[PDB]
Write a protein that binds this ligand. Structure first.
Ligand SMILES: CC(C)=CCC/C(C)=C/CC/C(C)=C/CSP(=O)(O)OP(=O)(O)O
Ligand SMILES: CC(C)=CCC/C(C)=C/CC/C(C)=C/CSP(=O)(O)OP(=O)(O)O
Ligand SMILES: CC(C)=CCC/C(C)=C/CC/C(C)=C/CSP(=O)(O)OP(=O)(O)O
Ligand SMILES: CC(C)=CCC/C(C)=C/CC/C(C)=C/CSP(=O)(O)OP(=O)(O)O
Ligand SMILES: [Mg+2]
Ligand SMILES: [Mg+2]
Ligand SMILES: [Mg+2]
Ligand SMILES: [Mg+2]
Ligand SMILES: [Mg+2]
Ligand SMILES: [Mg+2]
Ligand SMILES: [Mg+2]
Ligand SMILES: [Mg+2]
Ligand SMILES: [Mg+2]
Ligand SMILES: [Mg+2]
Ligand SMILES: [Mg+2]
Ligand SMILES: [Mg+2]
Lengths: 304, 304, 305, 305
């Protein structure tokens, strides 16, 4: 597997090792892992490492919140693969009022009190920015168990749906939270098209590198929760080629989205619409894209 | 054309007579109408009346801003029908920096100074709420000359496009501006699905009532600006029936979206999630749907 | 679900009881039902009753052939849901040379010899007309396992696909067979538009009533054979409404195809191209539409999943 | 637009200069061109040259038939752009009985007598093989004015339609005619998957190079005949990228179909299924793909709109 060249350069948060020990340690203490092999696999994935590659300009005293939130969403993402759509939906819906702080957790259930304590701690740190991450998380949670996953999709309809299932909007809100980067609604409206393009890049890069994992899951886990729903197989079907061939084509499409990103940002700036906040934001998106790809290329999660 | 029953009751702003006189009078003074027949056709349309049906709970001192904005948008909407997509786009793009206040108007050109003065006066009245209307308007302007109008579309793809072409988002921000109704990003995220449903209703009710007008325009106006792009045609073509039959089917679909609106709002309230600002906002959407329909049923713009 | 008003009036073939008892009796003797519950459910479907609603002016000595063919196709229709498209296709292709009479059945396999004996008997009664049903049937059969069921479709593309999957053309050739109604190659060209419209009505009325059944199936059968492919779901997702809402909208669309049927018919008559042969056929198409709907409204196949 | 690497070597028929002169000469005498500009454009397109790249192993005394047939189909393809679907359908349907030899041409109407005389001369040369090109040509002609061109299509649905509109099957029959290559029904059935794959390549390579021409047509010609129906626009819309970006992505997918052609061919041979006639046939398909691309990269038809 050979990626075509990219002009995007990744960056990693300076505190990645100390924060990853802190956050890995918290989940190894509290989360219900089934056995030692699963604990080792959890550490091998490097979930705080992908968080620190996503948000390398996070404030030093906020990056750990983002590591915790992405880590617990990954752990849940993997649990849902053993559930039906209905079970998975019941599982996520329990957590939504708890995330809001509206329902207290059952403290004998780690996922509930981990979720409750985390969002309470983020609101204590910055209430307004924390509150802006909630509905984007819920939108993602609901997409994860959407029966649209078991229905035929074309490439266009898939990318529209995958924007939610890849958590693009929660990642943008979490990036802003992590950086203390406040943007007005008018500013956010200005970069809507840049966001949508970025979402496709994140989606398809993840699909390419995680395909062998997902293929294996689809054959071994729950026929609904584990269902293969990915651009790799949607393009392979549409073009009647192999998955390997579809990945080569999708990679080339990913570099076209990187070019489009650069063009859209250049236009924003030329029209005099790139504020200091927006400049930081679109550079932030570029780190998400290159950081996700660097982690995807190297994590044991996808290679074993 | 027999409208299926509806539980939505329309409401009109109490100041409709006074404001209509004022705003109609302003455009009759400044807008370059080509002849007397057009001046009469302008008055006959009742553009301030549809605004007052749209925002019946607007603050007494803000409703005229809304009448002016929708009036000038309607006037431009009609001029664009006689231009190419390329000519329309150049026309609209010139007005966008002027709307932002970044570029002074040529005061010998009425659309330029009307646009400049209007936005300057809105920002003087409420800077932050006025600024939230700008990108929604520009989104709508750019939809009007999108070459996607000249290409095949199914009902789903069309509704997604029409959401921009009908100005759903600018109407929402304009409603909020006009009521002084401030909503947080989190509140707005909670009603995203309610907004999307409402958009379909506005789009298709307009398509139904404005069909004879748009058909006539497609036969006599510019080949691009006049191109017929509407749910009436799309459904007739997909189902292989007449435009008349398609309207009767679309009308039933509109009442289904009304029921869905009620369901979605009831769920929002049943969860603990309908804030007082949200309650005002979703009520406001219901006025928009019923008000648009009432105007569309009665305006001379559509019957002659 | 309250149907909207209709001007079409259904008719049932006079001999419905006799032929039902006869043909149900034949399949209860010969078909490989898995258990007693399945035998009771088969009887509850009333497959001979829908045949008698579809072709109420069939000749008295021909109607049983049509009940047999539609019964065995319904039965295979249900089996294919538990197969891959490849398995399903292999199953059907096996029956095609057998239906032609070119290949002997394995008499230890009831579907093969039931199909074999059926077609033999039909050609024995009217070789010319029986032969006209064959390619229509194979068309329909190949549609059933068409991988295009596993591809995204809008409503227009769906209706063109459904024409084959709902068996419009085999119902036409069967209707004609069962009535002794012969039509010239010229007469059949004139009604190609009336046919396409009628296919939409059969397709969608079935979609509406069979939705709950097909939904259950899409959750419990084979990921390919059982895949949900229906106008109710296509409209629900295109318009963002519930399945129940899409059913109410589609039903109104059905009534418009009815009005359009009447229009295309008068139009054929006003031009005077309405032959006596063509006139019986389009009245027969109207019986198919209204009969299909009456059966669908009442059959336990659709109300008890 | 730099084409990505290919392992295919295009070949050109050795009589290309002599046959181009003969066949261009014939159409310049008989066809009604609207002006001198159109006559020069015709010669610049080099329609005998694409024929000779498509079929470089054609028999020396048959290559001119293929050149004539593809030339007149290109000319008609362009005329249809100024017509409605209904007008173009009537136009094509008039030619079908004449192609068959069943109806005499109006000798004052060049398209009619050029088509009549050409198909008569092909049947005079090799009746059985000429006749096998007819239904593939008609299939293509009816695809050209098919309403589905005005309905939304995703990539998979489009490629399925474009197999007919690109004339894949007529090109295969014409290749076999021109090489005197006779295949059994069994041999033909064996290569269906190879055929389907090759069709996507022809289709998309053509879409890539002809996009600027077709875009201009869609802005200036008939709203139906001139309608933009192409993978370039479909992918640009689905992926949200520019047309140029879509072309670069689609070109990489064309090389994947080249690789897949090679794999299918290997497998045919690895099983026991590759005959001498099949080997010549699938090698001929490779020349079609590389030849069509080489012509498309260099013809003024696509670079000067
Ligand atoms: C895209 C990426 C590397 C990281 C996104 C970072 C995270 C955790 C975002 C939260 C939303 C989730 C869990 C997306 C996983 S997409 P998926 O289910 O396809 O991920 P998988 O392939 O299972 O690793
Ligand atoms: C939907 C409705 C009645 C009013 C919307 C109210 C306004 C002014 C919205 C601003 C954007 C415009 C002019 C949309 C017209 S949709 P169109 O071009 O289809 O309207 P037309 O049919 O030309 O009246
Ligand atoms: C259309 C109709 C009610 C009757 C036609 C009568 C028959 C048997 C025609 C033969 C072709 C078949 C099996 C159509 C059923 S469509 P399907 O698979 O959707 O039917 P289902 O919903 O499974 O009953
Ligand atoms: C594909 C290729 C180079 C040649 C095919 C050779 C020929 C003439 C085949 C006959 C069928 C036709 C006319 C296809 C043109 S595809 P089109 O209408 O897209 O061709 P255009 O882009 O107008 O040149
Ligand atoms: Mg996952
Ligand atoms: Mg996931
Ligand atoms: Mg993945
Ligand atoms: Mg308009
Ligand atoms: Mg408009
Ligand atoms: Mg309108
Ligand atoms: Mg069925
Ligand atoms: Mg079926
Ligand atoms: Mg059904
Ligand atoms: Mg063509
Ligand atoms: Mg062409
Ligand atoms: Mg082309």
């Amino acid at each position: 597997l050979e990626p075509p060249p990219s002009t995007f350069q990744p960056l990693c948060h300076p505190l990645v090792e100390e924060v990853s020990k802190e956050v890995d340690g918290y989940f190894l203490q509290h989360w219900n892992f089934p056995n030692e092999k699963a604990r080792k696999k959890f550490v091998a994935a490097g979930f705080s490492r992908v968080t620190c590659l996503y948000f390398p300009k996070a404030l030093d005293d906020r990056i750990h919140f983002a590591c915790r939130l992405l880590t617990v969403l990954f752990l849940i993402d993997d649990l849902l693969e053993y559930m039906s759509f209905e079970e998975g939906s019941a599982y996520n819906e329990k957590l939504i009022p708890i995330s809001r702080g509206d329902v207290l957790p059952d403290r004998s259930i780690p996922v509930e009190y981990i979720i409750y304590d985390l969002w309470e701690s983020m609101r204590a740190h910055d209430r307004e920015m924390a509150d802006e991450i909630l509905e984007p998380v819920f939108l993602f949670m609901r997409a994860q168990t959407d029966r649209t996953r078991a229905r035929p999709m074309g490439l266009g309809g898939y990318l529209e749906y995958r924007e939610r299932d890849v958590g693009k909007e929660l990642l943008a809100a979490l990036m802003r939270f992590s950086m203390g980067l406040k943007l007005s609604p008018s500013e956010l409206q200005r970069v809507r098209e840049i966001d949508a393009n970025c979402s496709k890049h994140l989606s398809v890069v993840n699909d390419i590198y995680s395909y062998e994992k997902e293929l294996y899951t689809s054959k071994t886990a729950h026929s609904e929760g584990g269902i293969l729903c990915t651009s790799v197989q949607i393009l392979a079907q549409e073009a009647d080629v192999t998955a390997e061939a579809a990945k080569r084509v999708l990679f080339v499409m990913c570099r076209e989205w990187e070019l489009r990103h650069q063009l859209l940002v250049a236009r924003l700036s030329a029209e005099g619409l790139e504020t200091p906040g927006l400049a930081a934001y679109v550079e932030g998106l570029e780190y998400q894209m290159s950081g996700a790809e660097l982690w995807s290329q190297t994590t044991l999660r996808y290679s074993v």
